[PDB]
């Protein structure tokens, strides 16, 4: 599917109506598996952090850590298919521009690659951008082959429009997810009992980002 068709016929109407959009089979099995291989190699060669401190504990031997991260620009050797994914995300957003709300998107973060180690940790309920830091759209790509949430957990639960009625999104292989980054979409990751990977980029709105500059 050409990016403009996906954008105009699906992403733009889904985002403006619901603030959330799920695209399955985004890149196809071959590219999806190559991204998986690159992320696993990052993991196996120690490129991730040790994980978010979950419980601090007076005996630090008992510390519990959760999601581990690494920031990826997309041009590093061994990361060029992650770079292909990132360019594919940009292609979609570029073909949306002027139609995602009244936002004018003019940049994005590097990719945050996340690894949940499977030790029963998740991610607490939160809003990505609660305080106007410039980020207007969250984009997540999942790469977990044959993920079964009834067995392994790890559901992303989003509370669309902030209301208590929630949407449960499995972190399925080759699934792409967009949602508004602000308080319209509080969300959380339920405990994961197997290794769970995801790649996130955030897109900036020009006006909000130009003002966040003075909030820094
Ligand atoms: O994995 C998923 O399906 C959902 N993940 C998130 O919702 C998330 N959100 C925010 C952050 C995050 C929040 C603050 C700082 C940084 Cl570097 C990352 C990490 C995160 O993993
Ligand atoms: Fe988040």
Swiss-Prot record:
Give the free-text PTM comment from the record: S-nitrosylation inhibits the enzyme activity up to 60% under aerobic conditions. Chelation of Fe(2+) has no effect on the S-nitrosylation. It is uncertain whether nitrosylation occurs on Cys-136 or Cys-139.
The entry's note on the tissues where this protein occurs is: According to PubMed:11056053, widely expressed with highest levels in skeletal muscle and heart, moderate levels in pancreas, brain (dopaminergic neurons of adult and fetal substantia nigra) and kidney, and lower levels in lung and liver. According to PubMed:12351678 widely expressed with highest levels in brain, kidney and adrenal gland. Expressed in cardiac myocytes, aortic endothelial cells and coronary artery smooth muscle. According to PubMed:12788921; expressed in adult and fetal heart, brain, liver, lung, skeletal muscle and kidney. Also expressed in placenta.
- Effect of mutating residue 139 to A: Slight increase in enzyme activity
Q: What is reported on the regulation of this protein's activity? A: Following exposure to hypoxia, activated in HeLa cells but not in cardiovascular cells.
Outcome of swapping residue 65 to A: Reduced C-terminal ODD domain (CODD) hydroxylation of HIF1A
Q: Which residues carry this modification: S-nitrosocysteine?
A: 14, 21, 115, 136, 139
UniProt binding sites for Fe cation: 126, 128, 187
The domain comment in this protein's record states:
The beta(2)beta(3) 'finger-like' loop domain is important for substrate (HIFs' CODD/NODD) selectivity.
Name the job this protein performs.
Cellular oxygen sensor that catalyzes, under normoxic conditions, the post-translational formation of 4-hydroxyproline in hypoxia-inducible factor (HIF) alpha proteins. Hydroxylates a specific proline found in each of the oxygen-dependent degradation (ODD) domains (N-terminal, NODD, and C-terminal, CODD) of HIF1A. Also hydroxylates HIF2A. Has a preference for the CODD site for both HIF1A and HIF1B. Hydroxylated HIFs are then targeted for proteasomal degradation via the von Hippel-Lindau ubiquitination complex.
* Protein name in the entry: Egl nine homolog 1
């Amino acid at each position: 599917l050409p990016a403009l068709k996906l954008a105009l016929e699906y992403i733009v109407p889904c985002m403006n109506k619901h603030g959330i959009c799920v695209v399955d089979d985004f890149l196809g099995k071959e590219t999806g598996q190559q991204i998986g291989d690159e992320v696993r190699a990052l993991h196996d060669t120690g490129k991730f952090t040790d994980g978010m401190l979950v419980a601090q504990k007076s005996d630090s031997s008992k510390d519990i850590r959760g999601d581990k991260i690494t920031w990826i620009e997309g041009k590093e050797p061994g990361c060029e298919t992650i770079g292909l994914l990132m360019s594919s995300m940009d292609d979609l957003i570029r073909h949306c521009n002027g139609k995602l709300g009244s936002y004018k998107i003019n940049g994005r973060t590097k990719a945050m690659v996340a690894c949940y180690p499977g030790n029963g940790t998740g991610y607490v309920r939160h809003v990505d951008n609660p305080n106007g830091d410039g980020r207007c759209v969250t984009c997540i790509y999942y790469l977990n082959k044959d993920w079964d949430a009834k067995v392994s957990g790890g559901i992303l639960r989003i509370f669309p429009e902030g209301k208590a009625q929630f949407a449960d999104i499995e972190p399925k292989f080759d699934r792409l997810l967009f949602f508004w980054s602000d308080r319209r979409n509080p969300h959380e990751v339920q405990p994961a009992y197997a290794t769970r990977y995801a790649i996130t980029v955030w897109y900036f709105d020009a006006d909000e980002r130009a003002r966040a500059k003075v909030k820094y």
